[PDB]
Structures are given as structure tokens and as C-alpha cells.
Amino acid sequence: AGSKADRPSLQIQTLQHAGTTMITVPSGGVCDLINTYARGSDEGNRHTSETLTYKIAIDYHFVADAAACRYSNTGTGVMWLVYDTTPGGQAPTPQTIFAYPDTLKAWPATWKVSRELCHRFVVKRRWLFNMETDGRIGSDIPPSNASWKPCKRNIYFHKFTSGLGVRTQWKNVTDGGVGAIQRGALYMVIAPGNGLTFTAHGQTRLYFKSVGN
């Protein structure tokens, strides 16, 4: 029950998405890298040129955006955890990672990995969620005559998984940006529901340890 657990404690890294930084997704998703690590004295930074990661836990809040609340429909969203072999010099975008005709852009949940890149990428986890809006903003006061049951306007999403493992190596620099990584990048992708745009709040943690040399 675990993965390569070791009696001494394991290092911790966090991310802060809130306030000024709120992941905001227009239709078509957004690409991002969660594996950023600095190098130096501070704890949580990588001490070596070789890093393995193990366990990851994710917490967030979601909320619909008023911009799309002018309509009433449900939908379905998607969150993937995508592993890379060799990253390009430029940041990927979903349209590049998944070959899809413009018609299917509405419904992401049918997307699957394109065959041309079949050995370049892989997806080690998948998750689903769904949300809907009735066409009413929260701050609006109901009239005294009648009411509403707005179940599941917003949702609380969390997952915890020990299964995965990843091997990463680094070019020699200080920085933690994408350009530094030689191999083993790790991407996170968010896919909105049809014609439904929203922003999210929350934070995540990672677990890893340096090794080698």
C-alpha cells in the first residue's frame, strides 16, 4: 500500500493559485506545467540533476463565470494528467496535443490522443466532472413570490493518488522553467464543458526526492 516509501520524510512542493493567479479557461482548454522546481539551499528545491516524483494530491474549488451564465444548459468537463518524453522548445497547446476536427471542439470528452504522436505522449490518469447553470447569478435576490433549488452550481473537487511514478533529468542551470528540462516533463490540462467557461481556485502539493551523483 504505497510507492517506494522510505522511512525518512520526503520533500514537499506546493503551488498557489488564488487572487491574482486564478487558472481561467476559455473554450479549448489550457496547457500548463506543474513540475517546476528550483535548485538551491531552500527546502523543496531540487538538490541534484535527477528527480523522481511519487505521490500527488489535488484540491480545488470551481465556480461558473457570469459571462456564460446568460444561457442555461449543463455540460461535462475533463481533467487529464499527461506525461511527456521530450518537450519541444515551445509550450504545447491542446489543439497540438490532440488532433481534433473543428466540429468536435464543442465536446472535449470524446477527444483521445492523436496517433502521430502515439509514442511521444501518454496519459497516466483521467478524471471526469460535471456542472450546470440555471442562468442566475448568485448575488441576485429572489422575488418574494417563488424560489429556486440551484443544486450543483459550484462543486468541490479533490483526488489523491499514489500510483504514478516519473523519472526526470535536467539541463544544468538554476532555473525551474520549462526550457531547463531535458526529459520527463509533466503537464496538466483542463477541458471545459460545451460553451461553458469558468475559473477555479485551489492549491496542490507534490512529493518527491532527489537522487543520483
Add this chain to the structure above:
Amino acid sequence: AGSKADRPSLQIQTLQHAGTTMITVPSGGVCDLINTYARGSDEGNRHTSETLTYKIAIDYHFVADAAACRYSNTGTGVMWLVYDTTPGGQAPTPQTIFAYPDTLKAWPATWKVSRELCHRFVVKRRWLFNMETDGRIGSDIPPSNASWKPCKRNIYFHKFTSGLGVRTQWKNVTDGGVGAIQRGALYMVIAPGNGLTFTAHGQTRLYFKSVGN
């Protein structure tokens, strides 16, 4: 199936929250201590300077407050059971126990224990619940034309757990207040949903036995 059970019966302590005493939570939660014990002849009071606790059961009723019923939205609440090592001379407050930016104050369920105190505190249990309001007070008479289904305006919450155990020692005094405890305090915390305030009714029991000397 149990924890350190012993053939003779175990002592019992109760708490009464009702009427004049109703836990009432404004946004941002409230700190409290449930482990208070007097010393003396009466049963339920501690006979010694050393106490272990075992099993705990919790029952309550919740109800929304009309003060927040002027709006209609759902939300999510949180109840933690937090264990302490060495209490300060002053009573803690959630903002102190959890480091959180003002932005996240809305959604508690993302809070997690701050790293500075990482070894000073720990959380041995966690629970979730959710509730919502439609913007209508109970005493209001529906008009004869139309009706409502107000499922889950109020909720019945209870849990029973034998798992935990706690070791506590006391300074030498009569009192059962917080200032007496040398080590092993036990806190209970309630986290309201976003912009949703309520009061609760109910009572709880404890189980323990004195030992030592």
C-alpha cells in the same frame, strides 16, 4: 474491533449545547475545547493527574440562519477534530491555526495545516457536509397557486468513531479550564460554507478512564 477495551465499565462525560448555549458560527469558524474535566468526587470528573481518552460519539442538529437566507446559494462546510501538543497561554483561533490568504477565506474546504506549525499540530479526523438555502424562511406560508420542494434545508449529522487515542497530563489545580492542561489538548473546529451562517443544536459524549499514581 475496539480500542483497549476493559471488562469494567468506563467513565462518561457529556456536553450540553442548547437553549442559552448554542454554538453560533460567523464566517471564519470558531475554536473550542471539548476535553474539559473537573476533579473531585463526582463521577465523570477525573480522579488523577493522568487521563487517556478512547471513543467519542457526536450528534447535532443544524439549521440555516434567516440572517443569511436573504440570498440563495449552496455551499460546503467542514468539521475537523484537531489534536494539540502544547497549548499556548491564550486560546487559538482558526486564522492562527491555518495560514490562509484573505482570498481563500470564502472557501474553507481547501484549507490545510500550515507548515510552520507542522509538528505542533495534527488532525486525526475529518468530515464533510453540505447544505443550501432557497431564500425562504420556514414560517412563511406558500401562496395557494404554487409550491416548493425544499429538500435539505436542515440536516441531521452524526458520527461514531473508536479509532483515536490521546494522552493527557494536568497541572495540579481543581479547575477544568484550558489553563490547567500541561499537554495533550483537544480542539473542535467548525467551518461554515461560503457566505452562509448558521447555528447548531445537539450534544456529545466522551469515554475515558484515569490512570497513574
Add this chain to the structure above:
Amino acid sequence: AGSKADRPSLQIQTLQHAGTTMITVPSGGVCDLINTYARGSDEGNRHTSETLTYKIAIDYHFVADAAACRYSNTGTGVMWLVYDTTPGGQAPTPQTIFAYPDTLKAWPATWKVSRELCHRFVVKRRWLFNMETDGRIGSDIPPSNASWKPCKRNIYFHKFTSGLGVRTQWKNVTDGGVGAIQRGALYMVIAPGNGLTFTAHGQTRLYFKSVGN
């Protein structure tokens, strides 16, 4: 290495001799009882009618008294730890505990237990110490011509012993005075050196546990 040690901790009792209370011994010694225990809720008080004691540690400071500093000679002192079977209704005095002619009153260290009481009393420990005075009070300023080496004007005395054990029972009352004890009293006695009077400072601890009933 120990006496009837038991995994749970053992109770503690202390005595405070300082300031207003300073044991002060004129020639001929002084009788005292160190075993006083109250009964009640407070820790250190006896919970039962039956008590055993085990380990005892003693610390004090000694200093000569200026009243006797008008002369210059050395001497030798004595400290006994005396155990009793049945105490009388009245407090004993050394002259009663030890039969000695008036001639020997000068040198205590030769005293030994009188034969008439041979089975009524016993001495489970003994200690020696010596001190001397040169005829000069501390606050006095030496003249600029010549000096002194006053080694051992005052002395630091301490002992620690686990050996003894004592069985005591009590009449039924609240008090901790001498009149309460039915059997097993414990006395401490201080014997000054010849024509040498002094006072002492310090404090002591005891170790015991209740048993029975």
C-alpha cells in the same frame, strides 16, 4: 539497581526551609519530623490510609553563625536518619532519644542509641561532616597589609540514597501532623559541633506511593 521501582511515575513531596523558616540549631540538636503528608485531592497528598516510602534526596547549604564566630576552633557535626515504631503523644527530644551524661554533651559524635529503648528505635542511615571558623565575619574588609585563606568556612552538603524503605499507617483524620500517625514515624536530627552554632538553608524531596484498601 533500585527499590521496588514501578513503570508508572511515583508521587513527589517537597519541603521548603528558607527565609522565615531556617532550621537553627543550638547546642544539643533539634528533633523534627519530615514525613508529614496531608490527605485530599492535591497531588503529593496521600490518597489512602497506608503509605510506603522509598527514595530520598537531601540538599542544603550550611553557614556558621556570627554568634559563635567570636572564637576560633574546628569541630565535627552529625546528621542521623532515625526511624520510629510507635511515637509517643509528645514530640521527642535528643536528650530523650540518646542517654548521655552531661559531660559528653560537648562531643555528639560519640553518642549512640540508648539500650533501654533498644527495640523502640533504630537508625537506618548516618552521615558526617566537619566545619571550622577562623574568628572573622564575612563582611569584614581585610587590611591592605596581609590576607587570609579561609578554606571551608561554609560547606555544600548533599546525599542521595535509594536503600531504605518504611511502612506507615495512619489514624483517620485530615491532618498531616505528628498526632495522626499510628505507626512508622520518621525523624531527622542535626547535631552541632562542640560549642559551634549555625543555621542551614536548603530543601529536600521525598518519593512514595499510596497502597491498600
Add this chain to the structure above:
Amino acid sequence: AGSKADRPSLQIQTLQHAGTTMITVPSGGVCDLINTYARGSDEGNRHTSETLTYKIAIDYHFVADAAACRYSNTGTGVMWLVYDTTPGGQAPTPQTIFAYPDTLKAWPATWKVSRELCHRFVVKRRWLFNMETDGRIGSDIPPSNASWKPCKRNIYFHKFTSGLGVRTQWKNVTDGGVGAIQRGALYMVIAPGNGLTFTAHGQTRLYFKSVGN
């Protein structure tokens, strides 16, 4: 014969007390922390967030101060090695670490750990020493008529011990001050003799190794 010795060498840290920095103790002792460690590249600084210490050796010179040489008496001093669990935000002082009435302030050697903090502190070593002054400063020329034997005006004190071990963890910063330590602080305390003030010279070494992560 040793403690957790390991074939590769162990790191070394030193302290320099001399010249500008001379520990100087007025009556009532002084609190200090010897465990300070920086973090960085340099040897002797801690490489990690977790440190164990093993063996310690202490050397010093003592000398009486002329300020107190205006009187002639002996006395007795004390040196403790005190271990801490959780340090406060403020530096402790002896009067806080040991509960003592103002009367006993004269003779430290009777002090013992106060009961209120009984589990917060502990003392893993103890040492005694004694010194005295005749009321004559060194630079003073004896008159040609008579002389003096001033044995033990100054003293050479050293100890070496492998027994102890200590577990310490750190908040994440660069600094080596007291505010950084999360748990496991280590204090050194010096207790002067009655009405006898002095300064000391010397230096000490430590032995430890980083571990973890």
C-alpha cells in the same frame, strides 16, 4: 565505547570566546545557546533541515574579577547543560527556567528544575566547581616582610563527554539564530558563587552530522 560512531569523519563546529567576547556573569547567571549553525557551502554549516549532535568537549579558563575582590570569602559555582523541547519566541532567563524565591538567590547550587515546566525542560549533565579569593589583586607587590600562599585563585576547567544525543529540526531559512529552530534547542548556563562575580576565557567544540531528505 562511543556513540553511533561512523567510519567517515564527522563535521566540526567551534566557538570563540575571548578578547571582545568574554562571557561575563553577574549574580543570577546568564542564558545562552551553543547550538547555532548556519546553512550553506562552508564546512561546519548544516547541509540539511535535520541535525543530530553527539559528542562535546569544553575547555575554559576562569578568573575572579577585581570588582568582587574587595571581600574575602569562598563559594561554589555550577554549570548545567540544559536541553529544550520547544523554545519560546523570546530568550529564556534563569529566573524563568528555575522557580526560586529571592532568598535562595545567594546559593544557586540548591536550585532544581521547577515543576510547572517539568516536561518542557530537562538537564542531561551537571558539573561543580569551587573558587575563592583572599582580597588581593594579582598585580599587587607583596611587602618584603611577609608572604602569601594564594592557592586556587584561578582554575582550569575542562570536561569531555560522549554520552548525550539530541535530535533537532529547523524552520527553512538561512540564519543560525534562535528564532529559526523548530524543536530541540540546547542551552548552557553558568551559576556564580555567592556574591562572587567573574569572567571566563576559553573555547569549545561540537560534533554532529546532517541527515534526512
